[PDB]
């Protein structure tokens, strides 16, 4: 599970700081090395976590 | 004793740059004949408690379209420098 966190404090927004919560979709199923993806909105710059 | 991108248009001719810092921030245009830059005075104390510096950014004439003119930004320390 992946969700964007809404920065309701303006101080976070002035830092240009995007935030995402990252979770297991069930607490009954252990897993390893699943790739989270990250991309810029022009489709160019990318990273895998 | 001594002390030691943005876009604008004919529908949106002003932008507001917000910047957070625990120390004073200078903001400049490299060209003050195509561009206008002014600090906004935060008359509400709520803005001041957020350490939030504010600058209005404008075209110097509505007859002269331009592109990619560098706004400069820097701390009073002189090293935390940025370009927009």
């Amino acid at each position: 599970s992946v969700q964007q966190i809404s920065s309701s404090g303006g101080d976070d927004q002035l830092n240009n700081l995007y935030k995402y919560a990252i979770q297991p979709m069930s607490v009954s199923t252990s897993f390893q090395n699943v790739p989270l993806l990250i991309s810029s909105a022009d489709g160019k710059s990318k990273t895998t976590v | 004793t001594i002390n030691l991108k943005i876009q604008l248009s004919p529908r949106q001719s002003t932008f507001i740059l917000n910047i957070q810092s625990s120390s004073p921030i200078f903001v400049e245009s490299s060209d003050n004949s195509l561009l206008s830059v002014q600090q906004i005075s935060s008359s509400g104390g709520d803005d001041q408690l957020n350490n939030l510096y504010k600058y209005a950014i404008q075209p110097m004439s509505v007859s002269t379209s331009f592109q990619n003119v560098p706004l400069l930004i820097s701390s009073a320390d002189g090293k935390s420098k940025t370009t927009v």
């Binding site: 022009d42 710059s45 990273t47 | 991108k5 990619n68 420098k81 370009t83 927009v84």
Partner: protein
Amino acid sequence: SSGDPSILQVDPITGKATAIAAGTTTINYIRNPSSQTQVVISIGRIKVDFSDQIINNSKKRYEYNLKFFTAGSDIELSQDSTIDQNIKGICTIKESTFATAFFEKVKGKEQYRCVVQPSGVATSSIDKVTLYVEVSNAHKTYQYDT
């Protein structure tokens, strides 16, 4: 000796040879037991290797490894310590002032690289950080780029 001194001139004593022309020839050991090696002279490709580097910090150097290949056959050149491939080159950034670059030979090898160093933090006015690389021989009798 050389089988063709106009393709490949050699010192009869200290074995040092210089690649003069593109072609194929031999170097021969005249003393008994006598011997030979064929030699072939050809750059026609560059590869840059990224090695998982992305330009996210101005207080880092981004150091990108070069590999060089023949004309027509795309065979990588011998990275051996009895050779100097005599490769000069120029690395720069194009379209963007966000970084500078240079060309570097890894001291004590036939291994070569680009080094890139940023000027600031990326504004959303930057479309690309276009790397450019030339390579040439010591005399510039040719150039090749990417």
